[PDB]
């Protein structure tokens, strides 16, 4: 029968590893680098677009940075199509929580549930896992500003600064060097861009090959604002830090 | 509207002695003011020295007896031809009757 | 070789190897004999034990008051198939107030075994059965094989070294067929038939298993001291 | 790969035969049936000295009149015991009586072959089911993952089974007392066990008509071990 | 390669090797034939007497569908029975809805589509039988032969099994020598002869002859078995022709 | 190489099972042809009855799908009949649901979509057939639409299918180059059938008797097949010219 | 539904998928459980290749199943969340029907049963997780410590360890733990747990987690400085 | 019986590649060239009508398809896969949007729904990916004119102009030179015809070329009058004659 | 079941619930506690159909306790009330709805404010300074309209509550066997033993 053609996506290797999870991570390692940096007064999300063409419409485009609700955003590394399936699920889960409790969802709860979905694809169903790693940037009134990452295994962890996708080894070393705990948002913006500028496989880092976003309390009095940067705004912040 | 029950009349009577027991019943079967049969038995030998009668609505009575006789048969198959004791038969019949708690067998049963 | 992974695959010569491997399980099973006259039908079964401390595996199963079988091969598969026969015999009684014909009993078993040989996932039954019975057309004996093939016979035998008993019955055909109105003599012929399949071992009191059905005889099984008469 | 319910060329189910190899790796379990009762005994086999041996539950009650000992992948036995307990209690509810030991064993053995492509594989555990009923008296059954069960006067299963079974062949007779059977299980267990037999790494139990199924205390077994050693030295 | 390991897989030729392998199981089986006549059809089959212990006349292989259709087959006998069981369900639902008994061409397609359905998936095995069948309906007599692939045609005469080529040759002579037509009673006698002639390809074990027929005049349009005097008369005719 | 057993992509972006289903099309060794008249659509096919024991009336690869739609198949008869039964059911259901007769091109699309599913879904094999649908559509007029195992379909001015399809195709191409029009400029369907047979004779290079051919004709409000005598009458007309 | 029998027997009588799940446990960070006279202590390793972590929000290694029972583990982190959730649900379900919190044995038996079910269910792989379950039964002062594993077997332990280099720390505990006299106080039990982890860990900084469970739902996690004091004390006594 | 293929037929290889997606992209590469160009006041999409036979009527086979009154689609790769995607894309525009909001979806969201369908064929049980790349041109009130590409993976990208299929590498280079942000619709049609002539080999006329635009509203193509807010479809398929007129002044 | 009251004061929420359980012409019990602690700073009182009341209360209790364990965090009174409302809103369109009315009294530790929510069996939620279910409200609402002040202490709230119970004992037809009173504040939940 059909047994002949089954790849057996949810099995262990002799060494105790999940083949498909490991290979999905190998896929993600070729995706455009995404960096998250958490400051005391906000969070930065920076991501490098995958080898841009000059005729690509840059202003009305969304590849890396997605909004889950007013308080939580994600940076994507891997298959965009796979990520959008998970994003719409996460968007729904956040609204279910709000409908139930009349409170915005805590960041970790949203992360855990999205990670539990990924876990399911590695243990049952016989389907391939999602070839996606997320950086979650968000705020709630319990823990304040939070950075998380999840990967195809369904395992998630919290971070002060983190990178996913390509050149994470090099990127993480640079972040580990220059990061400190009393850091401000504007400093974190500069660190994020400087790190990408050194780890990039491109010749020079330009505005058209970047997506950028911040989550500050820079609105008026005790409230959070999400700023998905426009092309011209990325151009200005790139000049202001002295990269171009 | 359709009424699924009926009354077939008749009456039954069980008495126990020291080393014996009797189960008697009249042989008349009726509907309303008409006689259907002057000789229609409703006291049956079910095997294992158990006699049974289910008097009231004859359709339900026959169905129950038929199910119990079948229960005795499968008791032999599943438990190495063991004799079904009268107390065990009684309990088995309870489950037959209570299984239709919300659409009852309209009968008064005696074994 | 490459065509024996499952029952859904034909070989290049048109063979079903999983069915043939199921057939092989019967040959490994202990010997059992079936034979009939015009008035009675008899099953004789050599029971097998694990060791001297163990009991002897029961080979004969009752299906109704007028029908039953003996088994050879996987015993749990015989339990499934005998249970199905009990239900079919019982359905015929409750619905039609009719004792199930031994021929229809065979037809139903054939069709049940067949479905397992044409579908993916399932497997063939790993047991052979000898069904005896007395119905409206007299005494009957059937031979069931898990390929689906059912065959009505005067006498037969299945299991290990069954060829010895089968040859004897082929010679004795004219004699035992006319043992009418005599149960003990028909059994004697069956006990002598199964004895042709014995090697080193002989028929003892807790080893032999006999069953009989007939005109004025319900299907009844004899074990233990009840078969001491026929040794 | 290949189907789960596949026959070998010799006419055996591959998975059933492979599960039998798993049972051979399991710890030893011995059962002996007498006219005064049925005795069940097991090797506990703690993997480490830090493991609290009293938590090793390889002898188990099914009903007051039916006990059970196991050997092999003992985790697989939990659902089998659960089914047995439910079958026993359910039969008492339906028929106001104790269930026959044979009928209980048959119910457990019906689960055995309910695997394929139902559960994904056969059970990797063999059971010794001991009990008493009014009809056939004291009985001992060996329930395998093939769906087959044999009644035994005495039986050993597990790693030291073939050696213990040969010993049970010589020692068993139809006039054994309960006390004699208790010592005989201890004697044979001590012979096939790797580590030295004591009250902490071996467990005894029995089923009698009068008192039902009882697992013996470590204090009670210790005295039977001491009684056994003295009797062997006495000749 | 490996194209023959799974059912419903096209080989590079455009062939389904699993179906062709089922045909080998049909070729291995006993001989069975069908003869179309003036106002009906006749079916006959070879039953190998494996042993003296087989009860004569009591292992019937020809099967009736509804009351007007006869079915016979060569190959895996259980597979044939499964197909007839389906045929009976198909015929019953046709009569239930449309009142009239199922026409033979209509019935032929019901089996055809069902057999063809068992070549569409790897989860099922093809049928290991070629089935010769037919009967009498409102439009007259019809004879059909259905193969493991689901392929079927109408026939003047049909044959399958181990002695098919011998039977086909003998059938072709009847078609040539009787252009105006063959009668029902004649077709029974010829059927007996052709089975006896086709038995030369399976002559180790001796055999038992079994014949059935549907005819508008002789059987009143219903399927009946040939028994007693008419059977023995057909056997004697066949015995005289071999010598 | 399990990518050649089921309908999944090979490294070079191909579906081998689909390609092998195309080769099954020619297994019968029959050639079909379809042309359009002014008022009609004619389809013709070779009829080969090798076995003498066969009932030749039951040997057919042309099907009456609906009253208006006809279908000829190139491929094995089991798959042909499978497709025919499904098309008949689809045509009937369409009429019931939407209140008008299913058009030839719409049925062709529907059967093509079904064929497409078999090329994408693994458990279902492609049917080894090419389906040529013909009618006189009430909106589009004379219509020829053809379906294959890939799920491809298109309308045709005329078409041919079979082993010697290319020879027939070019024969028809050269005629429409000459005539300068999209159809057979002819009043009666009888002469359109004569054209079809004549050009098949020229392309294949074989002569035909009455029993060597099979003819289907679509007119306004009915599709029908010709008997042996209807074809014989048609063959006589060609011979006497 | 996906039906495939992934966990199956091999010719030698082994279920390789269950055995390969044990290898995933062997890869996981070390976890240790030691029970004293009036307490149980759960110690856990945290690998130090991860700097720039946020320890406030990062999932803790020891999880509360109820107010009186805790669960630690070794193996796949994602798998452990599924077992913990199921256990937490069953804990509340038990309180609802029996009107009494779960015993530690009962909770263990449930978790172990879930693990076993995944070794003979179609379409699923076994949990790549072993657990240490510790706590105190309701209205009971006797310490309880149980272990589970992918196969589904469970058992009680005076002291036990699981995960990577667990055979080294088990060796340590086998000679240092006296059955006749377990750690009499909380300090003695924590020290023995920290000592056992110091055989394997690397540094005693932010690599060791300690959780102390006492009777009547008295559970507390130790901070860095509190743990560091035990590390400082042990090293000074070692230099002798 | 029954679909026993409940497992994924697309899986990750050791190198991290998804084989069936890569192979689907290879099938797209073999396919005939199609392109799209965005202007200031419109969008053009175009492709070659590769005729299977000269007896075949290429008018009956439509490579450029209307999805909504303001959205159109063209492809490169496997035609049957495209046809079913158009059927599903049309239906999903109604079921998941128009039947809820009483208006047609904006281009980006309809593209998102098509992308979802194509992603599911990459992960669901017993199916292969779609062997096509789509170019979807459209207009909506709040986003204006837009052009999207959709690949077999389910990934989609917005373009100022692009090409897919056989000669896409050369065609994209040609478009980079000619494209500016001040292009009028007629200028974009002119460039589309120039770009497409490079990839086409045989005949180059209105009968072998299929071209449609997303431009101004067409009240004449609406089919009714009386509702002022309803001004007609922005999608228009250029006729065979209309193409030939622009080929003279080429 | 019958009488459940609630009063939110400056620094606490006070719930009073009748002790009588009546069936037919018999008072089966006179010491029944018609409340469940959902979390350390959230208390729910309930009244309605026999069986449904306790079954619903304990079901909600289990879910909140599950949440507390999972997140190691106490849900706000507003969050618990919204959860409860949604459950009742589902219930009302079920095959057999929960015929249970509830009051949820809680102290929000983040806001340092007491909160009282009144929810009926339809899923009709309102935040109130004082609340009641059943026929009680027909007396207590007007009484509290007069005597209630927003800046009252817990002791003043208890005297205000005594005034309600006295009025109900005077004018209600049924003997409800007094009330159990419970206070919810910053320090958690405690029971007044002498009322
Ligand atoms: Cl469709
Ligand atoms: Mg209200």
UniProtKB/Swiss-Prot annotation, chain B:
Q: Where in the cell is it found?
A: Cytoplasm; Nucleus
The UniProt similarity line reads:
Belongs to the peptidase T1B family.
Q: How does it assemble?
A: The 26S proteasome consists of a 20S proteasome core and two 19S regulatory subunits. The 20S proteasome core is composed of 28 subunits that are arranged in four stacked rings, resulting in a barrel-shaped structure. The two end rings are each formed by seven alpha subunits, and the two central rings are each formed by seven beta subunits. The catalytic chamber with the active sites is on the inside of the barrel.
- Report the function annotation for this chain: Non-catalytic component of the proteasome which degrades poly-ubiquitinated proteins in the cytoplasm and in the nucleus. It is essential for the regulated turnover of proteins and for the removal of misfolded proteins. The proteasome is a multicatalytic proteinase complex that is characterized by its ability to cleave peptides with Arg, Phe, Tyr, Leu, and Glu adjacent to the leaving group at neutral or slightly basic pH. It has an ATP-dependent proteolytic activity.
What name has this protein been given in UniProt?
Answer: Proteasome subunit beta type-6
Write down the species. Saccharomyces cerevisiae (strain ATCC 204508 / S288c) (Baker's yeast)
Swiss-Prot record, chain D:
- Residues with PTM Phosphothreonine: 47
User: Residues of the signal sequence?
Assistant: none
Q: Where in the cell is it found?
A: Cytoplasm; Nucleus
Q: Name one Pfam family in it.
A: Proteasome
Q: Source species, please?
A: Saccharomyces cerevisiae (strain ATCC 204508 / S288c)
GO cellular component terms, alphabetically, are: nucleus; proteasome complex; proteasome core complex, alpha-subunit complex; proteasome storage granule
Similarity section:
Belongs to the peptidase T1A family.
> What keywords is this UniProt entry annotated with?
Cytoplasm, Nucleus, Phosphoprotein, Proteasome
Q: What does this protein do?
A: The proteasome degrades poly-ubiquitinated proteins in the cytoplasm and in the nucleus. It is essential for the regulated turnover of proteins and for the removal of misfolded proteins. The proteasome is a multicatalytic proteinase complex that is characterized by its ability to cleave peptides with Arg, Phe, Tyr, Leu, and Glu adjacent to the leaving group at neutral or slightly basic pH. It has an ATP-dependent proteolytic activity.
Coiled coil ranges (UniProt) are none
**Protease as UniProt keyword:** no
- Protein name, UniProt field: Proteasome subunit alpha type-5
**Subunit and interaction comment:** The 26S proteasome consists of a 20S proteasome core and two 19S regulatory subunits. The 20S proteasome core is composed of 28 subunits that are arranged in four stacked rings, resulting in a barrel-shaped structure. The two end rings are each formed by seven alpha subunits, and the two central rings are each formed by seven beta subunits. The catalytic chamber with the active sites is on the inside of the barrel.
Residues modified as Phosphoserine:
48
Misc: Present with 17100 molecules/cell in log phase SD medium.
- Keyword Phosphoprotein listed: yes
UniProtKB/Swiss-Prot annotation, chain E:
| Transmembrane segment boundaries | none
What does the protein in this record do? The proteasome degrades poly-ubiquitinated proteins in the cytoplasm and in the nucleus. It is essential for the regulated turnover of proteins and for the removal of misfolded proteins. The proteasome is a multicatalytic proteinase complex that is characterized by its ability to cleave peptides with Arg, Phe, Tyr, Leu, and Glu adjacent to the leaving group at neutral or slightly basic pH. It has an ATP-dependent proteolytic activity.
GO molecular function, a single term = mRNA binding
Question: Quick check: keyword Acetylation in the entry?
Answer: yes
Spell out the protein name for this chain.
Answer: Probable proteasome subunit alpha type-7
How would you summarize the oligomeric state and partners of this protein?
The 26S proteasome consists of a 20S proteasome core and two 19S regulatory subunits. The 20S proteasome core is composed of 28 subunits that are arranged in four stacked rings, resulting in a barrel-shaped structure. The two end rings are each formed by seven alpha subunits, and the two central rings are each formed by seven beta subunits. The catalytic chamber with the active sites is on the inside of the barrel.
Q: State where it is primarily located.
A: cytoplasm
Q: What is stated as this protein's family in its record?
A: Belongs to the peptidase T1A family.
Spell out the note in the miscellaneous section.
Present with 12000 molecules/cell in log phase SD medium.
Q: Which UniProt keywords apply?
A: Acetylation, Cytoplasm, Nucleus, Proteasome
Concerning PTM, the database record says: The alpha and beta forms are probably products of the same gene with different post-translational modifications.
UniProt organism field: Saccharomyces cerevisiae (strain ATCC 204508 / S288c)
Q: Where in the cell is it found?
A: Cytoplasm; Nucleus
Instruction: State whether keyword Ligase applies.
Output: no
Curated annotation (Swiss-Prot), chain H:
Localization: Cytoplasm; Nucleus
- At which residues is the cross-link Glycyl lysine isopeptide (Lys-Gly) (interchain with G-Cter in ubiquitin) found? 108
Which SUPFAM superfamilies does the annotation name?
A: N-terminal nucleophile aminohydrolases (Ntn hydrolases)
GO BP terms in the entry: proteasomal ubiquitin-independent protein catabolic process; proteasome-mediated ubiquitin-dependent protein catabolic process
One of the record's GO cellular component terms: proteasome complex
**Stored InterPro entries:** Ntn_hydrolases_N, Proteasome_alpha, Proteasome_alpha-type, Proteasome_asu_N, Proteasome_sua/b
Instruction: Note the superkingdom of the native organism.
Output: Eukaryota
Family, similarity comment: Belongs to the peptidase T1A family.
Anything else the record notes?
Present with 7060 molecules/cell in log phase SD medium.
What's this protein's name? Proteasome subunit alpha type-2
Q: Organism source for this protein?
A: Saccharomyces cerevisiae (strain ATCC 204508 / S288c) (Baker's yeast)
Q: Which gene encodes it?
A: PRE8
């Amino acid at each position: 029968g059909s047994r002949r053609y089954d790849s057996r996506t949810t099995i262990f290797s002799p060494e105790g590893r999940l083949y498909q999870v490991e290979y999905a991570l190998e896929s993600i390692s070729h995706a455009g680098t995404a960096i998250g940096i958490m400051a005391s007064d906000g969070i930065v999300l920076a991501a490098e677009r995958k080898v841009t063409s000059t005729l690509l419409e840059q202003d009305t485009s969304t590849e890396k940075l997605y909004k889950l609700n007013d308080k939580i955003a994600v940076a994507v590394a891997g298959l965009t199509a796979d990520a959008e399936i998970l994003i719409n699920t996460a968007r729904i889960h956040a609204q279910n929580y709000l409908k139930t409790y009349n409170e915005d969802i805590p960041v970790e709860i949203l992360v855990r549930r999205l990670s539990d979905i990924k876990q399911g694809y590695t243990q049952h169903g016989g389907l391939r896992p999602f070839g996606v790693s997320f950086i979650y940037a968000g705020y709630d009134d319990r823990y304040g500003y939070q950075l998380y990452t999840s990967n195809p295994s369904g395992n998630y962890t919290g971070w002060k600064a983190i990178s996913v996708g390509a050149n994470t080894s090099a990127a993480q070393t640079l972040l580990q060097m220059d990061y400190k705990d009393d850091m401000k948002v504007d400093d974190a913006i500069e660190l994020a861009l400087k790190t990408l500028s050194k780890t990039t496989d491109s010749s020079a880092l330009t505005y058209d090959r970047l997506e950028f976003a911040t989550i500050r309390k820079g609105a008026n009095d005790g409230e959070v604002y999400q700023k998905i940067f426009k092309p011209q705004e990325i151009k200005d912040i790139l000049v202001k830090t002295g990269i171009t | 509207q359709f009424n699924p029950y009926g009354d077939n009349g008749g009456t039954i009577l069980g008495i126990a002695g020291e080393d014996f027991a009797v189960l008697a019943g009249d042989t008349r079967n009726i509907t309303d003011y008409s006689i259907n049969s002057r000789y229609e038995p409703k006291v049956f030998d079910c095997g294992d020295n158990i006699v049974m009668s289910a008097n009231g609505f004859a359709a339900d009575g026959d169905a129950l007896v038929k199910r119990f006789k079948n229960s005795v048969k499968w008791y032999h198959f599943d438990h190495n031809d063991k004799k079904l004791s009268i107390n065990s038969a009684a309990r088995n019949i309870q489950h037959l009757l209570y299984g239709k708690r919300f659409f009852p067998y309209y009968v008064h049963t005696i074994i | 070789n490459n065509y024996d992974g499952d029952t859904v695959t034909f070989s290049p010569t048109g063979r079903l190897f999983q069915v043939e491997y199921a057939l092989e399980a019967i040959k490994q099973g202990s010997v059992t004999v079936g034979l009939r006259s015009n008035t009675h039908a008899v099953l004789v079964a050599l029971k097998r034990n694990a060791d001297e401390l163990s009991s002897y595996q029961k080979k004969i199963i009752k299906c109704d008051e007028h029908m039953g079988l003996s088994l050879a091969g996987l015993a749990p598969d015989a339990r499934v198939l005998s249970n199905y026969l009990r239900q079919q015999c019982n359905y015929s009684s409750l619905v039609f107030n009719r004792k199930l014909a031994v021929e229809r009993a065979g037809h139903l078993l054939c069709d049940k075994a067949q479905k397992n040989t044409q579908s993916y996932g399932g497997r063939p039954y790993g047991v052979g059965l000898l069904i005896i019975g007395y119905d409206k057309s007299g005494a009957h004996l059937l031979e069931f094989q898990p390929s689906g093939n059912v065959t009505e016979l005067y006498g037969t035998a299945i299991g290990a070294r069954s060829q010895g008993a089968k040859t004897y019955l082929e010679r004795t055909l004219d004699t035992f067929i006319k043992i009418d109105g005599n149960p003990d003599e028909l059994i004697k012929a069956g006990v002598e038939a199964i004895s042709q399949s014995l090697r080193d071992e002989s028929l003892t009191v807790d080893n032999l298993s006999i069953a009989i059905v007939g005109k004025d005889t319900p299907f009844t099984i004899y074990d233990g001291e009840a078969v001491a008469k026929y040794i | 790969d290949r189907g789960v319910s596949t026959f070998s060329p010799e006419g055996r189910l591959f998975q059933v035969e492979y599960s039998l190899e798993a049972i051979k790796l399991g710890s030893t379990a011995i059962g002996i049936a007498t006219k005064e009762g049925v005795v069940l005994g097991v090797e506990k086999r703690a993997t480490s000295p830090l493991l609290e041996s009293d938590s090793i539950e390889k002898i188990v009650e099914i009903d007051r009149h039916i006990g059970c000992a196991m050997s092999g992948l003992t985790a697989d036995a939990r659902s089998m015991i659960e089914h047995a307990r439910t079958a026993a209690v359910t039969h008492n509810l339906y028929y106001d009586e104790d269930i026959n030991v044979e009928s209980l064993t048959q119910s457990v053995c019906d689960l055995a072959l309910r695997f394929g492509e139902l559960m994904s594989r056969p059970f990797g555990v063999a059971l010794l089911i001991a009990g008493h009923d009014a009809d056939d008296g004291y009985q001992l059954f060996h329930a395998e993952p093939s769906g087959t069960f044999y009644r035994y006067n005495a039986k050993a299963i597990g790693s030291g089974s073939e050696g213990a079974q040969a010993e049970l062949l010589n020692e068993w007779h139809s006039s054994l007392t309960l006390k004699e059977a208790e010592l005989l299980v201890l004697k044979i267990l001590k012979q096939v066990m790797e580590e030295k037999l004591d009250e902490n790494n071996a467990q005894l139990s029995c089923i009698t008509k009068q008192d039902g199924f009882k697992i013996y205390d470590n204090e009670k077994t210790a005295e039977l071990i001491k009684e056994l050693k003295e009797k062997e030295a006495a000749e | 390669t490996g194209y023959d390991l799974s059912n419903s897989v096209f080989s590079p030729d455009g062939r389904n090797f699993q179906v062709e392998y089922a045909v080998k199981a049909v070729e291995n089986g006993t001989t069975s034939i069908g003869i179309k006549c003036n106002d009906g059809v006749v079916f006959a089959v070879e039953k190998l007497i494996t042993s003296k212990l087989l009860v004569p006349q009591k292992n019937v292989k020809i099967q009736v569908v509804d009351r007007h259709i006869g079915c016979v087959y060569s190959g895996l006998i259980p597979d044939g029975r499964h197909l007839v069981n389906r045929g009976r369900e198909e015929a019953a639902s046709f009569k239930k809805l449309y009142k009239t008994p199922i026409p033979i061409p209509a019935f032929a397609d019901r089996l055809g589509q069902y057999v063809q359905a068992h070549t569409l998936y790897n989860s099922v095995r093809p049928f290991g039988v070629s089935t010769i069948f037919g009967g009498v309906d409102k439009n007259g007599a019809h004879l059909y032969m259905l193969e493991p692939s689901g392929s079927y045609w109408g026939y003047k005469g049909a044959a399958t099994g181990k002695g098919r080529q011998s039977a086909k040759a003998e059938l072709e002579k009847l078609v040539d020598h009787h252009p105006e037509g063959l009668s029902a009673r004649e077709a029974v006698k010829q059927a007996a002869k052709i089975i006896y002639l086709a038995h030369e390809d399976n002559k180790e074990k001796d055999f038992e002859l079994e014949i059935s027929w549907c005819s508008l005049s002789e059987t009143n349009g219903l399927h009946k078995f040939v028994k007693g005097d008419l059977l023995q008369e057909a056997i004697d005719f066949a015995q005289k022709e071999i010598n | 190489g399990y990518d050649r057993h089921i309908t999944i992509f090979s490294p070079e972006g191909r579906l081998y099972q689909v390609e092998y289903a195309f080769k099954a099309t020619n297994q019968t060794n029959i050639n079909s042809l379809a042309v359009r008249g002014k008022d009609c659509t004619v389809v013709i096919s070779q009829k080969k009855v090798p076995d003498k024991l066969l009932d030749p009336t039951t040997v057919s690869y042309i099907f009456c799908i609906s009253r208006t739609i006809g279908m000829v198949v190139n491929g094995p008869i089991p798959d042909a009949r499978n497709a025919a039964l499904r098309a008949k059911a689809e045509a009937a259901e369409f009429r019931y649901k939407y209140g008008y007769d299913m058009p030839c091109d719409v049925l062709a699309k529907r059967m093509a979509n079904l064929s497409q599913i078999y090329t994408q879904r693994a458990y279902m094999r492609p049917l080894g057939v090419i389906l040529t649908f013909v009618s006189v559509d009430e909106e589009l007029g004379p219509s020829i639409y053809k379906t294959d195992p890939a799920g491809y379909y298109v309308g045709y001015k005329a078409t041919a299918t079979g082993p010697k399809q290319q020879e027939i195709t070019t024969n028809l191409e050269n005629h429409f180059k000459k005539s300068k029009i999209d159809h057979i400029n002819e009043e009666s369907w009888e002469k359109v059938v004569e054209f079809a047979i004549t050009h098949m004779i020229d392309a294949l290079g074989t002569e035909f008797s009455k029993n060597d051919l099979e003819v289907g004709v679509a007119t306004k409000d009915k599709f029908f097949t010709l008997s042996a005598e209807n074809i014989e009458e048609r063959l006589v007309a060609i011979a006497e010219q | 539904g996906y039906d495939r029998a992934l966990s199956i027997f091999s010719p030698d009588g082994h279920i390789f998928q269950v055995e390969y799940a044990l290898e995933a446990v062997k890869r996981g960070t070390c976890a240790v459980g030691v029970k004293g006279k009036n307490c149980v202590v759960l110690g856990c390793e945290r690998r130090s290749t991860l700097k720039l972590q946020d320890t406030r929000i990062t999932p803790s290694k020891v999880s509360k199943i109820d107010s009186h029972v805790v669960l630690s583990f070794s193996g796949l982190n994602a798998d452990s969340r599924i077992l913990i959730e199921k256990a937490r649900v069953e804990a509340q379900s038990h309180r609802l029907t029996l009107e009494d919190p779960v015993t530690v044995e009962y909770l263990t038996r449930y978790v172990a049963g879930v693990q076993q079910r995944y070794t003979q269910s179609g379409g699923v792989r076994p949990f790549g997780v072993s657990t240490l379950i510790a706590g105190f039964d309701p209205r009971d002062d006797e310490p309880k410590l149980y272990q589970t594993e992918p196969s589904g077997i469970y058992s009680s332990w005076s002291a036990q360890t699981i995960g990577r280099n667990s055979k080294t720390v088990r060796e340590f505990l086998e000679k240092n733990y006296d059955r006749k006299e377990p750690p009499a106080t909380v300090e003695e039990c924590v020290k023995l747990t920290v000592r056992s982890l110091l055989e394997v860990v690397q540094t005693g900084a932010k690599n060791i987690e300690i959780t102390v469970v006492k009777p009547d739902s008295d559970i507390v996690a130790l901070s860095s400085e509190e743990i560091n004091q035990y590390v400082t004390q042990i090293e000074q006594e070692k230099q002798e | 019986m029954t679909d026993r293929y409940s497992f994924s037929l697309t899986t990750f290889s050791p190198s991290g590649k998804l084989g069936q997606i890569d192979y689907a992209l290879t099938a797209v590469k073999q396919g005939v060239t199609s392109l799209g160009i965005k202007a200031t006041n419109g969008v053009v999409i175009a492709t070659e009508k590769k005729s299977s036979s000269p007896l075949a009527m290429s008018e009956t086979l439509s490579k450029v398809s209307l999805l909504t009154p303001d959205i159109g689609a063209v492809y490169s790769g496997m035609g049957p896969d495209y046809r079913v995607l158009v059927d599903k894309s049309r239906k999903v525009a109604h079921t998941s949007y128009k039947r809820i909001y009483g208006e047609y979806p904006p281009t980006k969201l309809l593209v998102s729904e098509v992308a979802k369908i194509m992603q599911e064929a990459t992960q669901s049980g017993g199916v292969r990916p779609f062997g096509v790349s789509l170019l979807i041109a459209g207009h909506d009130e709040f986003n204006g004119f837009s052009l999207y590409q959709v690949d077999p993976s389910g990934s989609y990208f917005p373009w100022k102009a692009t090409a897919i299929g056989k000669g896409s590498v050369a065609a994209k280079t040609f478009l980079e030179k000619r494209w500016n942000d001040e292009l009028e619709l007629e200028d974009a049609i002119h460039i589309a015809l120039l770009t497409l002539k490079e990839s086409v080999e045989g005949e180059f006329n209105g009968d072998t070329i299929e071209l449609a635009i997303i431009g101004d509203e067409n009240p004449d193509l609406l089919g009714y009058t009386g509702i002022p807010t309803d001004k007609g479809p922005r999608f228009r398929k250029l006729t065979s004659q209309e193409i030939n007129d622009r080929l003279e002044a080429l | 079941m019958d009488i459940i009251l609630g009063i939110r004061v400056q620094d606490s929420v006070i719930l009073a619930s009748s002790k009588a359980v009546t069936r037919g012409i018999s008072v089966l019990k006179d010491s029944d506690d018609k409340t469940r602690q959902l979390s350390p700073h959230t208390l729910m009182s309930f009244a309605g159909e026999a069986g449904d009341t306790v079954q619903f209360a304990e079901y909600i209790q289990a879910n909140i306790q599950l949440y507390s364990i999972r997140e190691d965090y106490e849900l706000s009174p507003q969050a618990v009330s919204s959860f409860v409302r949604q459950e009742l809103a589902k219930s009302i369109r079920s095959r057999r709805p929960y015929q249970v009315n509830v009051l949820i009294g809680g102290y929000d530790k983040k806001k340092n404010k007491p909160e009282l929510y009144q929810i009926d069996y339809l899923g009709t939620k309102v935040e109130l300074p004082y609340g009641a279910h059943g026929y009680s409200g027909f007396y207590t609402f007007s009484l509290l309209d007069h005597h209630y002040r927003p800046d009252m202490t817990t002791e003043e709230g208890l005297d205000l509550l005594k005034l309600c119970v006295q009025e109900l004992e005077k004018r209600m037809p049924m003997d409800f066997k007094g009330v159990i009173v419970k206070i919810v504040d910053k320090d958690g939940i405690r029971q007044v033993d002498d009322f």
